[PDB]
């Protein structure tokens, strides 16, 4: 604003640009450099010449190009209007940018607003009375953006506390229009529906709370083996093209949470294009009639052909957005695509900075940022009089080299993670369903997840431990069979192998393209596991009666085919028909008795 | 005794088959991967050392002026 | 034009008494012997500038050399007359033709497609190969690579693909492709030339040829020119643009060489740290544009070092491109037609060209079932080779014979033989008949009753 | 005080034209946002100085910031009123309490114990676990390192050990968190609250959300607290460092920012003296009834104990506690691998007068049986399922038996040494009396019952 704090471009190499003659610019502060006024963040400083890292393309820039420091750090706008909006690395709308530039390509040095200032919304003062003392985090009003998610909270701006002075009447307004005025020790300050918050500092809350509320995964293996609750950190390491983006999209699809934050980082443009194309086609079938998945989610786009720092910037922006969603008193989740790309981006950042590399070319501050991002999310009560309990889940996809866990990314991720879900290329190459190693993937939140699963008085722990023990025994039996042979084993071992194949084909294997096996309900998976354990116990009891395994498997074909037919089933109605099949097993045991 | 010798010969043949395409291949692959990891780590360390030497040489060249 | 130069070290250049230099700017270097070499600006600091020489710093005088700076960034002379004419890696005509008239001068770096403006891959195409249809589908406008090995018939497979592409596609306006080579062999160049000549697509296609004898900079710059050409063809010309690129390994090793020559901080396997983004530059350039007709389909070809699928090249390629077609040397020594490994080879979206309304709804399920039977056949082959032929169950031997037949018949057709999609689906339906009724659990009852004769 | 700076590289700050600078001194800096932070001077050269920020250099303007140096080194306010309370990484109370009255103020770096004033502890402290108090003897005043892996519940084992720890004088426990996770802190708080020893314990909390660069001083502060507890209060003190790997990574980061000569895994060259300083927080003194014993815990990178951190921690300290991922994946209780695990303090703490005369012999016999069982397991993997004739079969059986019983005592169960001795006597009944070459004539004739 005509302050004219300006440094001059000195040294320019790749994305890194060192600018001198500026003592006013701080570290990690937003500044407009070049002739195109491109955004950038200063990293280091040497003498009177500070080294600045550009988050955009440095192509076309030349020496002598002025650099203006804003004096403030990186910040993003928080409030209504961010929903169902695709924002770039600068958090600018992609559709509006493409419409303004009138080109399908990406320009350089373009300046656009995050939300739409011409957008109108119907806001109503949320249960707040005039004259009442309010502070930061308190809801000053409510506005409905969509037909599903209603009353998008307008939060009181940070570092503000006092008494409500002049609060205008409810009605239709915009994000740039002040909906309230509060008098305090800081004299007069204008308050609007939209509040700007720094991306470097996550949205604060009241106090950290213990999360007893399990988040529904929708996947059998995800609900059973490695559990993920609300506020929990679940790693998603996988190989290149191992279905990581597919698993991420499915996770953003079948999620039982409120909102969804999906930030693509260094991924393919076809993925985001297919996501945007299939967004409107998918609509919710629950409460809040007439609502798509696009309106119930937010997408941040950092292209593979885009800048390296744009990925980390979109990651931090997505973290701040997820923190704002968690501050709204609702359970949300953050979907990160290929965080290893951001790691490599940091590697090139520190590498071009002249700093010494540690592991895989990456810096030593990688683990700190990873642990910070992991400890950033969680389940805690948010700010404000409402005293609502918010939740933020962290889901990050890792793309290690050669699928090796020895990579720095996998180690640093697994270190700060309380839960980890591995992706295998073995069953992915065979066009089999979702691939996860049962002998590798584990979760430390499984206990509290079982305690939470006990609310429906299901047994998570017993069935899971029995299936895992049977799986390990099947692994040892597989090693032994591969060692000597299948004729060197006993009846119990063979029954364990058959049960292993049955558990692999009829349980672990579920078609995602199917209209049934694509999503498995809690009661459905519980009943399936119960019937499996019952059939296993019955088979073991029959084997101990002096009956051969082959003869027992001869008349069990009906119950086997029936157990394999439990994958299709039907909607919520007619679930009992599945339970009845369990009886058909019991009778079958009697049929084996005669 | 001849029958038992036949069974034992079968077990021996099975052990030979297990020592052919199973243990040998696993050991070879493991040795290859370990060699690759060790060589890569040594290359990274040598690169860091070269960067350190280059830094010292640059500092000395800067002080020489 | 600045005649002032200061130092010289290795394959690089440094000049002084200049200002306002542009990143990757076009610069003309006139040497003491009169040799004119094109170069790009690397970095600029204060009154000093540093650039990299394409033709090398060998045999150049310091004070006898002059340099002319355009100030503009990297610029290529794109036109509509490039079709039918061959060009070298340096942009100069390899067809020994006259001066090419440029319709537009544009940056060869290429512009990333906007996410909102980016359209998802759709429709379909006929590659003439069953594996390129049934096992892994190939969408039109999508991007999939090809992983081969040294000594294998990679050039032959690529030639067959390029020849049968437009021929088979018409059974689904001719398809237009682009041939690009960077630091390849002269024999492979002759083979590719004879391939394009035999296909007769050379008239409707453009060729960028960078010899191995030529510099690494020109070879690396060839991909950029080809990218800008394909982009101009898929946007300005509004035509279907197929992208055929070969010898990516040479460009990768050359990139590592350039990274090491500048003493830059290397990444994994001694390669560059920006290598992922460097490949992603031309990798994410492929796709469809909303409102704009035509699309750019990327069909790259690379060779894994020492036939190692665990190599950093293939890993980074898969980390950049979405999906790939793997070629194993195991089936290459079998004497059978070209060795595509169904397990390792996969497509990013195979469900886009599947389902009803496109071709048939019996495609995807049959693909999954065939892949399942093939994998089970492979595991059963390992088990049979381990314990014995009498130690395996009936399903094991059945899946073994089924996979063997799939390799001998379905996988083996020919280079000059283009199999129709209908013929592929029919042969697959006949292949599933070899297996039992309870063998395939990935197939539906209706399709099972319909396909079975 | 100086408002003038030269340049800033990462977290490291460098100023020029500075006079009367103090190396390794505490400095209070006021930033442009009004925020105040603490830092420590790394080095000083000529008229210029180089200092490092513990809370980070992010979000600070060079012009509007003022650096006030006290001119003296770091001095912590050690007090006896810190019992039952809690403090943050900067020293501020996290217990939402007021400022306690300081008894004394001295350096947090502590002081080196004299060679002739040292005392070698013969003390025998019951661990409570059958696989602990027996295999590697827990002794007050000694140092036992703890190495874990990623996703491993080492915190649960540490908490269960701390609960079964606390003969008329109880043992005070001091904890130091370096870059500890929020969930880890929550679980530790839940365990400490479940035990009820929180009133007799105190710690400085540095979380992952908080700066990890200020966590290095936190461990030193806790060390000075233990030193002040041993040299003044005269009581049994137990120090524990959580996530020491993060501390090593932070130190490696500080060394990398200094552009000095890096060692293995990017560690500093003087780290050998640094790590030793972390291991120097233990040991008793002559004439002091109290005993201070540090029990640090770190996570080995990529589940590899061959890493520089675990290697140095194992080479410096006497003995190390290793945790196998396989046995933890088995579902059984705590997965301590007796092969890698050892104790140098199990010598003088064994024999008659301490525990039993059958202690050392049964320990060596247990190690021999475990090793034989391991070799028999590898043989069982290479050879058939016949368990390699007779000896290897009994060895494998005894190994599995000791694994399903002796190895897992349960987390909520506290067993004495006699119970573990009887259980081992019952577990050794499977093997022949002449099958043990590690047992002497008296030890073989010890328990025939």
Can you offer a commentary on this structure?
The structure is cut from a larger assembly and holds one copy of chain A (594 residues), one copy of chain B (65 residues) and two copies of chain C. In chain A, the strands form five sheets. In chain A, strands 8, 18, 19, 20, 21, 22, 23, 24 and 25 form a nine-stranded mixed β-sheet that branches. Chain A is an alpha+beta fold and 594 residues long. Chain A is built from 15 helices and 25 strands. In chain A, helix 10 crosses helix 12 (522-543), helix 11 (491-508) runs antiparallel to helix 12 and helix 12 (522-543) runs parallel beside helix 15 (576-593). By secondary structure, chain B is mainly alpha-helical. Chain B is rod-shaped, with a radius of gyration of 27 Å. The termini of chain B are far apart. Chain C is an alpha/beta fold and 453 residues long. The longest helix of chain C is centred in the C-terminal third of the chain and has 24 residues, at 363-386. Chain C contains eleven helices and 18 strands. In chain C, helix 6 crosses helix 7. In chain C, strand 11, helix 3 and strand 12 form a beta-alpha-beta unit. The relative contact order of chain C is 0.12. Chains in contact: A-B, A-C, A-D, B-C, B-D. At the A-B interface, loops of A face helix 1 and helix 2 of B. Chain A: This is V-type proton ATPase catalytic subunit A. Chain A: The modification Phosphothreonine is found at residue 112. Chain A: One of its GO terms (molecular function) is mRNA binding. Chain A: ATP binds at residues 238-245. Chain A: It comes from Saccharomyces cerevisiae (strain ATCC 204508 / S288c).
Label this structure with key terms.
4 chains, A: alpha+beta, nine-stranded mixed β-sheet, 25 strands, globular, C: alpha/beta, five-stranded antiparallel β-sheet
What is the secondary structure topology, with strand pairs?
This is part of a larger assembly, with one copy of chain A (594 residues), one copy of chain B (65 residues) and two copies of chain C.
Chain A (H helix, E strand, L loop, with lengths): L5 E8 L2 E5 L8 E5 L4 E9 L2 E6 L11 E8 L1 E4 L7 E2 L6 H8 L19 E4 L8 E3 L3 E5 L8 E4 L5 E6 L4 E3 L4 E7 L2 E6 L2 E4 L8 E2 L11 H5 L8 E5 L6 H11 L6 E7 L1 H10 L19 E6 L5 H18 L4 E7 L1 H14 L13 H11 L1 E4 L7 E10 L9 H9 L2 E2 L25 H8 L6 H24 L7 H18 L13 H22 L5 H6 L2 H8 L11 H18 L1
Helix pairs in contact in A: 5-6, 7-8, 10-11, 10-12, 11-12, 12-15
Chain B lengths: L1 H17 L4 H42 L1
Chain C lengths: L12 E3 L9 E6 L5 E10 L2 E6 L12 E8 L2 E3 L7 E3 L15 E3 L11 E2 L11 H5 L10 E4 L4 H15 L7 E9 L1 H14 L6 E6 L4 H20 L5 E6 L1 H14 L13 H9 L3 E3 L5 E6 L1 E3 L7 H9 L2 E4 L19 E2 L15 H24 L7 H17 L10 H12 L12 H7 L2
Helix pairs in contact in C: 2-3, 6-7, 8-9, 8-10, 9-10
């Amino acid at each position: 604003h005509a302050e004219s704090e300006y440094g001059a471009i000195y040294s320019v190499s790749g994305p890194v640009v060192i600018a001198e003659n500026m003592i006013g610019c701080a570290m990690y502060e937003l500044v407009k450099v070049g002739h195109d006024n491109l955004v950038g963040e200063v990293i280091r400083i040497d003498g009177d010449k500070a080294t600045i890292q550009v988050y955009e393309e440095t192509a076309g820039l030349t020496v002598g190009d002025p650099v203006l420091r804003t004096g403030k750090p990186l910040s993003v706008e928080l409030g209504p209007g961010l929903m169902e909006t695709i924002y770039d690395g600068i958090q600018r709308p992609l559709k509006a940018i493409k419409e303004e530039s009138q080109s399908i390509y990406i320009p350089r040095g373009i300046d656009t607003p995050a939300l739409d200032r011409t957008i109108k919304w119907q806001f109503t003062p949320g249960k707040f009375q005039v004259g009442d003392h309010i502070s930061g985090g308190d809801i000053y009003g409510s506005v409905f953006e969509n037909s599903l998610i209603s009353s998008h909270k307008i939060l009181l701006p940070p570092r503000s506390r006092g008494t409500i002075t002049w609060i205008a009447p409810a009605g239709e307004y915009t994000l740039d229009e002040k909906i309230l005025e509060v008098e305090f020790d800081g004299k007069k300050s204008d308050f609007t529906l939209y509040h700007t918050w720094p991306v470097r500092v996550p949205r604060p809350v009241t106090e950290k709370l213990s999360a007893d509320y399990p988040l529904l995964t929708g996947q059998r293996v995800l609900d059973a083996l490695f559990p993920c609750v609300q506020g929990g950190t679940t790693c998603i390491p996988g190989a290149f093209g191992c279905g990581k983006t597919v698993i991420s999209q499915s996770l953003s699809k079948y999620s039982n949470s409120d909102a969804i934050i999906y930030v693509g980082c260094g991924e393919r443009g076809n993925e985001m294009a297919e996501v945007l194309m299939e967004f409107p086609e998918l609509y919710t079938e629950m409460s809040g009639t007439k609502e798509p998945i696009m309106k119930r989610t937010t997408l941040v786009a950092n292209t593979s052909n885009m800048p390296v720092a744009a990925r980390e910037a979109s990651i931090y922006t997505g973290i701040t957005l997820a923190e704002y969603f968690r501050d709204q008193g609702k359970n949300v989740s953050m979907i990160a695509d290929s965080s290893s790309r951001w790691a490599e981006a940091l590697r090139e950042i520190s590498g071009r900075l002249g700093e010494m590399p540690a592991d895989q070319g990456f810096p030593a501050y990688l683990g700190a940022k990873l642990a910070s991002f992991y400890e950033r999310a969680g389940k805690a009560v948010a700010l404000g009089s409402p005293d609502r309990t918010g939740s933020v889940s962290i889901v990050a996809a890792v793309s290690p080299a050669g699928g090796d866990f020895s990579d720095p990314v996998t180690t640093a991720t697994l270190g700060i993670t309380q839960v980890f879900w591995g992706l295998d290329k073995k069953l992915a190459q065979r066009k089999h369903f979702p691939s996860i190693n049962t002998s590798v993937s584990y979760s430390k939140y499984t206990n509290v997840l079982n305690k939470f699963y006990d609310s429906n008085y299901p047994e998570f722990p017993v069935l899971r431990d029995r299936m895992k023990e049977i799986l390990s025994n099947a692994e040892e039996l597989e090693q032994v069979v591969q060692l000597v042979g299948k004729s060197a084993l006993s009846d119990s071992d063979k029954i364990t192998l058959d049960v292993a194949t049955l558990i692999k084909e009829d349980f672990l294997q579920q078609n995602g393209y199917s209209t049934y096996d694509a999503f498995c309900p809690i009661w459905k998976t519980f009943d399936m596991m119960r019937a499996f354990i019952s059939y296993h116990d019955e088979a073991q009891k029959a084997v101990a009666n002096g009956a051969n395994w082959s003869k027992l498997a001869d008349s069990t074909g009906d119950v086997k085919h029936a157990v394999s037919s439990s994958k299709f089933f039907e909607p919520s109605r007619g679930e009992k028909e599945v339970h009845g099949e369990f009886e058909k097993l019991l009778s079958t045991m009697q049929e084996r008795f005669a | 005794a001849f029958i038992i010798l036949d069974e034992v010969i079968k077990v021996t043949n099975r052990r030979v088959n297990a020592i052919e395409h199973v243990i040998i291949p696993r050991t070879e692959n493991t040795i290859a991967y370990i060699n690759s990891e060790l060589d890569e780590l040594d290359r990274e360390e040598f690169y860091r050392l070269k960067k350190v030497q280059e830094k010292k040489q640059n500092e000395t060249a800067k002080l020489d002026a | 034009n600045y005649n002032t130069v200061s130092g010289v070290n290795g394959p690089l250049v440094i000049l002084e008494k200049v200002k306002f230099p542009r990143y990757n700017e076009i610069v003309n270097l006139t040497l003491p012997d009169g040799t004119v070499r094109q170069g790009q600006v690397l970095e600029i600091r204060g009154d000093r500038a540093i650039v990299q020489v394409f033709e090398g710093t060998s045999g150049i005088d310091v004070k006898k050399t002059t340099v002319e700076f355009t100030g503009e960034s990297l610029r290529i002379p794109v036109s509509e007359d490039m079709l039918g004419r061959i060009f070298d890696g340096s942009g100069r005509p390899i067809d020994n033709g006259p001066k090419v008239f440029a319709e537009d001068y544009l940056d060869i770096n290429g512009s990333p497609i906007n996410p909102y403006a980016r359209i998802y891959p759709e429709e379909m195409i006929s590659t003439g190969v069953s594996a390129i249809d049934t096992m892994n589908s190939i969408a039109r406008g999508q991007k999939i690579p090809i992983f081969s090995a040294s000594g294998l018939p990679h050039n032959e497979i690529a030639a067959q693909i390029c020849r049968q592409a437009g021929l088979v596609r018409p059974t689904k306006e001719n398809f237009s492709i682009v041939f690009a080579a960077m630091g390849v062999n002269l024999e492979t160049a002759r083979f590719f030339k004879q391939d394009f000549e035999e296909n007769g697509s050379l008239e409707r296609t453009s060729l960028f040829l960078n010899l191995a004898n030529d510099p690494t900079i020109e070879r690396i710059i060839t991909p950029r020119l080809a990218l800008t050409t394909a982009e101009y063809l898929a946007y300005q010309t509004e035509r279907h643009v197929l992208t055929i690129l070969t010898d990516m390994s040479s460009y990768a090793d050359a990139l590592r060489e350039v990274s090491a020559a500048r003493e830059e901080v290397p990444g994994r396997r001694g390669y560059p740290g920006y290598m992922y983004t460097d490949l992603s530059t031309i990798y994410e350039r492929a796709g469809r544009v909303e409102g704009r007709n035509g699309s750019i389909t990327q069909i790259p070809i690379l060779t894994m070092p020492n036939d190692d699928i665990t190599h950093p090249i293939p890993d980074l390629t898969g980390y950049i491109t979405e999906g790939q077609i793997f070629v194993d040397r195991q089936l290459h020594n079998k004497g059978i037609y070209p060795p595509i490994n169904v397990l390792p080879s996969l497509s990013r979206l195979m469900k886009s060209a599947i389902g009803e309304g496109m071709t048939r709804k019996d495609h995807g399920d049959v693909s999954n079932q065939l892949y399942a039977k093939y994998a089970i056949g492979k595991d059963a082959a390992a088990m049979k080779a381990v314990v014995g032929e009498e130690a395996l169950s009936i399903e094991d031997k059945l899946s073994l014979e089924f996979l063997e037949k799939f390799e001998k018949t379905f996988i083996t057709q020919g280079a000059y033989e283009d199999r129709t999609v209908f013929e592929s689906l029919d042969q697959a339906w006949s292949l599933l008949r070899i297996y039992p009724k309870e063998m395939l659990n990935r197939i539906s009852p209706k399709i099972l009753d319909e396909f079975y004769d």
